[PDB]
From Swiss-Prot:
<keyword id="KW-0472">Membrane</keyword>
<dbReference type="GO" id="GO:0043190">
    <property type="term" value="C:ATP-binding cassette (ABC) transporter complex"/>
</dbReference>
<protein>
    <recommendedName>
        <fullName>Glycine betaine-binding protein OpuAC</fullName>
    </recommendedName>
</protein>
<keyword id="KW-1003">Cell membrane</keyword>
<keyword id="KW-0813">Transport</keyword>
<keyword id="KW-0029">Amino-acid transport</keyword>
<keyword id="KW-0564">Palmitate</keyword>
<keyword id="KW-0732">Signal</keyword>
<dbReference type="GO" id="GO:0022857">
    <property type="term" value="F:transmembrane transporter activity"/>
</dbReference>
<comment type="subunit">
    <text>The complex is composed of two ATP-binding proteins (OpuAA), two transmembrane proteins (OpuAB) and a solute-binding protein (OpuAC). Interacts with FloT.</text>
</comment>
<dbReference type="Pfam" id="PF04069">
    <property type="entry name" value="OpuAC"/>
</dbReference>
<dbReference type="GO" id="GO:0045121">
    <property type="term" value="C:membrane raft"/>
</dbReference>
<keyword id="KW-0449">Lipoprotein</keyword>
<comment type="function">
    <text>Involved in a multicomponent binding-protein-dependent transport system for glycine betaine.</text>
</comment>
<dbReference type="InterPro" id="IPR007210">
    <property type="entry name" value="ABC_Gly_betaine_transp_sub-bd"/>
</dbReference>
<dbReference type="GO" id="GO:0006865">
    <property type="term" value="P:amino acid transport"/>
</dbReference>
Length: 268
């Protein structure tokens, strides 16, 4: 149709990720806030969303996805966030490092390391790009700790080596969190820790931390994205670090969709 709206072009459909993720919750809210209730949000997964993104992009087809930043797709593709004047996705979002309760006094050495873990979107991007191109996260992390010596010394500042202390990192298989988890896991490994990486859904990751079935996680997006999880387990986890600031999430489109610039444009 020559005069097709944005809505018409994508058939009132948004391509999402795993249904337990916060971005999906926030998108459910956005759709109510912007009176997009006749729209369909497709639950899927990180990998299905990016495969779908690839197919549409290479054909220059209209598509709207649940996107976030830090993510390699912004490097691979020319994408933009739809303006969110209602701030349905919130503001001032960060990635946090959380532990099971008591961990800081229980394992103060590892807690100090975890509290001092910080890095940038481009630094995480280094790992994520190499992982999507086919390298194993463990090997890419090993490259990173060797390449970035001065940073790793910052993280380990006043942190000591140990003799086999067990530690269990819960994580969710988002591209960003696979990168942060493996890089910190390697640093712990280099420090002498016996490291287990426990992959879980969103929901289960919070539950693991809140019950102490896992020790720590780098997968907390706060305060907006995992608002509901944090509220559910309010007194039952410690927030010991902020590994990244200025992170974002929302509805994302290719830049070739020139006339679609705000979530308000989807009302049409």
């Amino acid at each position: 149709d020559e005069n097709a709206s944005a809505a018409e072009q994508v058939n009132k459909t948004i391509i999402g990720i795993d249904p337990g993720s916060g971005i999906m919750s926030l998108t459910d809210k956005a759709m109510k806030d912007y009176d997009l209730n006749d729209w369909t949000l497709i639950s899927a997964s990180s990998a299905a969303m990016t495969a779908t993104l690839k197919k549409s992009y290479d054909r220059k087809k209209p598509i709207i996805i649940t996107g976030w930043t830090p993510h390699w797709m912004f490097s691979r593709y020319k994408l933009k966030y739809l303006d969110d004047p209602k701030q349905s996705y919130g503001s001032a979002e960060e990635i946090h490092t959380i532990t099971r309760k008591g961990f800081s006094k229980e394992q103060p050495n590892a807690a100090k390391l975890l509290s001092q873990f910080k890095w940038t979107q481009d630094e995480m991007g280094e790992i994520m790009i190499k992982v999507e191109e086919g390298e194993k996260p463990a090997k890419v992390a090993a490259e990173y700790v060797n390449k970035h010596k001065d940073q790793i010394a910052e993280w380990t500042k006043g942190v000591q080596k140990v003799k086999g202390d067990k530690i269990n990192l819960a994580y969710v298989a988002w591209d960003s969190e696979i990168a942060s988890t493996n890089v910190i896991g390697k640093v712990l490994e280099d420090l002498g820790y016996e490291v287990t990486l426990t992959q879980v859904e969103a929901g289960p990751m919070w539950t693991a931390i809140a019950t102490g079935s896992a020790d720590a996680s780098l997968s907390a997006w706060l305060p907006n994205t995992h608002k509901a999880y944090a509220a559910k387990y309010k007194g039952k986890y410690d927030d010991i670090g902020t590994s990244m600031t200025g992170v974002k999430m929302g509805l994302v489109v290719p830049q070739y969709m020139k006339n679609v610039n705000s979530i308000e444009d989807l009302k049409k």
